[PDB]
Ligand binder design. Structure first.
Ligand SMILES: [Mg+2]
Ligand SMILES: [Mg+2]
Ligand SMILES: [Mg+2]
Ligand SMILES: [Mg+2]
Ligand SMILES: [Mg+2]
Ligand SMILES: [Mg+2]
Ligand SMILES: [Mg+2]
Ligand SMILES: [Mg+2]
Ligand SMILES: [Mg+2]
Ligand SMILES: [Mg+2]
Ligand SMILES: [Mg+2]
Ligand SMILES: [Mg+2]
Ligand SMILES: [Mg+2]
Ligand SMILES: [Mg+2]
Ligand SMILES: [Mg+2]
Ligand SMILES: [Mg+2]
Ligand SMILES: [Mg+2]
Ligand SMILES: [Mg+2]
Ligand SMILES: [Mg+2]
Ligand SMILES: [Mg+2]
Ligand SMILES: [Mg+2]
Ligand SMILES: [Mg+2]
Ligand SMILES: [Mg+2]
Ligand SMILES: [Mg+2]
Ligand SMILES: [Mg+2]
Ligand SMILES: [Mg+2]
Ligand SMILES: [Mg+2]
Lengths: 113, 200
RNA sequence: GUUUGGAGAGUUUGAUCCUGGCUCAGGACGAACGCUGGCGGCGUGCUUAACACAUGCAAGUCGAACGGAAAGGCCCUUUCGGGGGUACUCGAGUGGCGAACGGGUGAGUAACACGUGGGUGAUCUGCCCUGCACUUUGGGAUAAGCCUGGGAAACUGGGUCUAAUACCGAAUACACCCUGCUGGUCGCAUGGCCUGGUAGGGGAAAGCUUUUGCGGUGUGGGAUGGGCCCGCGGCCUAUCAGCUUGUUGGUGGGGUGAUGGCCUACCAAGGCGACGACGGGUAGCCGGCCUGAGAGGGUGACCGGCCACACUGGGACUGAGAUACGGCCCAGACUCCUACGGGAGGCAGCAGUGGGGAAUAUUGCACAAUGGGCGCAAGCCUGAUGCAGCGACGCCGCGUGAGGGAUGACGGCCUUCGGGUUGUAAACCUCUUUCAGCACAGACGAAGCGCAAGUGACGGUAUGUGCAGAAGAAGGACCGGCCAACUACGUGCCAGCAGCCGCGGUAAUACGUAGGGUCCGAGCGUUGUCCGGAAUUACUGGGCGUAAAGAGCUCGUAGGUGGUUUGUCGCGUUGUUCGUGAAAACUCACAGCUUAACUGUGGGCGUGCGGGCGAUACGGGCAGACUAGAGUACUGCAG
């Protein structure tokens, strides 16, 4: 069966995962049919991106998600949408963008002067 | 590693001021040792080599790290000599020296290494840390009243502060508006000889 | 269009110029060796014997298929020796699925093995997804159990007995498979399509569960994974010139999922080769890596993709799928057991042992994370994997202190006996404790998992906050010229040095030591290996009068090359667009680790190849024209 898996990238103690469509038999770090997303658990909130157009196609043809990929598809709303259930908007959290560096430079200029 | 041996003998061999406040250099501007007076045969290689030695023993960078700096400078789109100089100028121990909070680049290194500075609110004790545009460098609370740093506050004036740096507060807060262009950088060295040395 | 990119030196001579080889300075490594050695991050580690292998693990799982009841549990019961029931549960066994993946190694292979691009009107595809139809009806066994036999053991026979989603017969299916006839249509010749129409014959199933409920059969489409065929591309060797008779082609059969001498009978006499056939040698191939200005050269460790093999050789079986590493059968070598009749093994899985060698690690800890197998699920399994241990083996980062300190100590070493060096160095005087040390806090990785409410192997690690005190932390090579750095003493062609030229013959900047110096630094040197320098195999980019080099001279075969001009094709060439050129790597940008190494994201790169469309100057093909090249004719002529 063709499945949607996490493949491990990154270095020791820094697991970064790509969301890939691959045959069940293929080894984890093996050739993938498509990369449809990425998942970085070490972040807060863990980084999640999914190409929803491709996720819908692959679930349509019958790709079977793995357990963690199924959790991610529910957060993104791609699972609920594919099935017809509600919640398609999803509950995806995004990291608050840190203050821009230029603005903090202006802040320091004003503060001291 | 670091070079921790005598500092004057290096400036004496190279015939130029590295610390620039050194009385023992001006007293004996000839190279060190028994034969330091004797006539040395000229060669282009010795000239190129000594310009490299002036660079790396001014900033306190080992040859391994300095050669990586060269490759980056040559890779960068500008002219290699300007890129190399401003990369070494971006070093945090150098920025601290240019700001005035230290007496010597050796003193600047020790301070940064011992954990007295913060960059954009995060502690950095890496002397080779390269500052970028709009970096803000601050002093931790414990080291603000620290006796040599107190000296540094009321010893402002030893050297001039370059335009890309700016000390804005009595907290001794350093701002970097940009990386220095070659004109901004003022160093007793001919950079074109080092580019030629590594093209050998 | 276009800058991002090329350094040389020594050595033939009395001297010179040239030619030409040799040698050196650079970079790289799955390294080894010598001296030396503080810490951390991230990688990496049998290159030799595809040598032999002690020991433990590396593949199981399902009571929601089944009879059952050895262990637990619960319920009777007791005398307390045991004996029943239940089926929550579960040993052994039947049955299903998995075991063909994942992991290892590079022996073989010079081949459609691999890379890249196509073809299949010549094909298969379990589980997964999504339409349609269905899931009717009977039957006979057997493992396990119990009794008993044979055998030293491995194992094995007989009787009796039981069940199923195990096995087996029939009906139905008319989507599907086979055959005959026949209509339309699309091409690329076999042919393909219209589930075309029509006649005749034929092809299945299985139940369980009471809960997020799971299943079974045929058939249409999809997705995935393949099979087979072909163009083009990447080693040395004619001191290897002929090779081939299922061999080359055809027809009738056989065989396969499918095409095909794949097999077979007959018939024809072909097929492949100096565009190196057939031999010999070597070698897994590639993305990439190293070097290089580039072109090129070398290389294929790790990581990623294919292939091949699994003690050696041969064979098939089961299955959707098999080089079947931890399956089976046979033969051989080797090890072991035996009652001598006969049996049992296979680390090129992980760890480990012996051996070979200059040389390469622990008989760790977890399934917490990611991937995989089974299960409705809870879960179980997983030496995949995530981590830990060991080796400066590599890369990167940091420390071994900072400021001040004199006409400048002692001591060492030179000397023109004036001193001069070491040297601001040291002593001393203050200043900060990074990394180590001693305390106290203490993770992220888990919008996970179980929803029962507990759950992180790494780990009380990383990282924060306190304390004490410069406190614990520098070596290696070189110093004649290349090539940075010079003197004294000791031996005097000796002992020794050396990459090359060359240094040692009682005054050596070359030997050994010392002082001083230089280059690098937790490393520094040496050896081996590849590229560079080497325009020294020269496509970019060289030569042949005398330096190495014109065949003794012709003729001519293949091949290479081609005057002027008209038209045409659009093969070479050129433009454009689309497809492809996996990821990683590389490169540009940007972000994340305190920085960096490293890691991630988005462009470019991927020079190529295939399809469509455009141009026709030039090369080429095709059809013509012309006479200046070439040849002929005629008239003279010399030898
Ligand atoms: Mg280092
Ligand atoms: Mg091996
Ligand atoms: Mg059981
Ligand atoms: Mg296998
Ligand atoms: Mg059956
Ligand atoms: Mg036939
Ligand atoms: Mg081989
Ligand atoms: Mg070259
Ligand atoms: Mg079969
Ligand atoms: Mg084995
Ligand atoms: Mg097996
Ligand atoms: Mg092993
Ligand atoms: Mg040995
Ligand atoms: Mg899992
Ligand atoms: Mg679950
Ligand atoms: Mg086990
Ligand atoms: Mg010199
Ligand atoms: Mg060459
Ligand atoms: Mg060479
Ligand atoms: Mg020549
Ligand atoms: Mg000629
Ligand atoms: Mg000659
Ligand atoms: Mg001749
Ligand atoms: Mg010809
Ligand atoms: Mg022509
Ligand atoms: Mg021709
Ligand atoms: Mg790629």
């Amino acid at each position: 069966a063709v499945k949607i898996k996490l493949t491990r990238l990154g270095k020791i103690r820094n697991p970064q995962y790509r969301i890939i469509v691959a045959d069940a038999r293929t080894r984890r770090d093996g050739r993938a049919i498509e990369v449809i997303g990425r998942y970085h658990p070490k972040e807060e909130p863990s980084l999640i991106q999914i190409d929803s157009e491709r996720a819908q196609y692959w679930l349509g043809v019958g790709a079977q998600p793995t357990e963690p990929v199924l959790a991610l598809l529910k957060i993104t709303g791609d699972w609920q949408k594919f099935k017809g259930l509600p919640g398609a908007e999803g509950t995806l959290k995004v990291k608050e963008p840190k203050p821009s560096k230029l603005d903090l430079f202006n802040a320091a200029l004003a503060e001291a002067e | 590693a670091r070079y921790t041996g005598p500092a004057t003998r290096k400036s004496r061999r190279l015939g130029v001021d590295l610390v620039g406040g050194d009385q023992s250099f001006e007293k004996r501007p000839y190279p060190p040792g028994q034969h330091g007076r004797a006539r040395i045969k000229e060669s282009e290689y010795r000239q190129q080599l000594q310009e490299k030695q002036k660079a790396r023993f001014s900033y306190g960078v080992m040859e391994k790290q300095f050669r990586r700096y060269y490759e980056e400078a040559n890779r960068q789109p500008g002219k290699t000599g300007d890129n190399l100089l401003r990369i070494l100028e971006s070093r945090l121990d150098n920025v601290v020296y240019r700001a005035g909070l230290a007496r010597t680049r050796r003193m600047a290194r020790q301070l940064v290494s011992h954990g007295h500075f913060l960059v954009n609110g995060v502690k950095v004790d890496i002397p080779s840390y390269r500052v970028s545009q709009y970096d803000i460098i601050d002093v931790k609370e414990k080291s603000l009243n620290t006796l040599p740093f107190q000296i540094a506050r009321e010893t402002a004036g030893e050297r001039p502060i370059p335009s890309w740096l700016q000390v804005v507060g009595e907290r001794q807060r350093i701002l970097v508006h940009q990386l220095p262009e070659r004109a901004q950088i003022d160093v007793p060295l001919t950079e074109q000889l080092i580019v030629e040395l590594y093209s050998k």
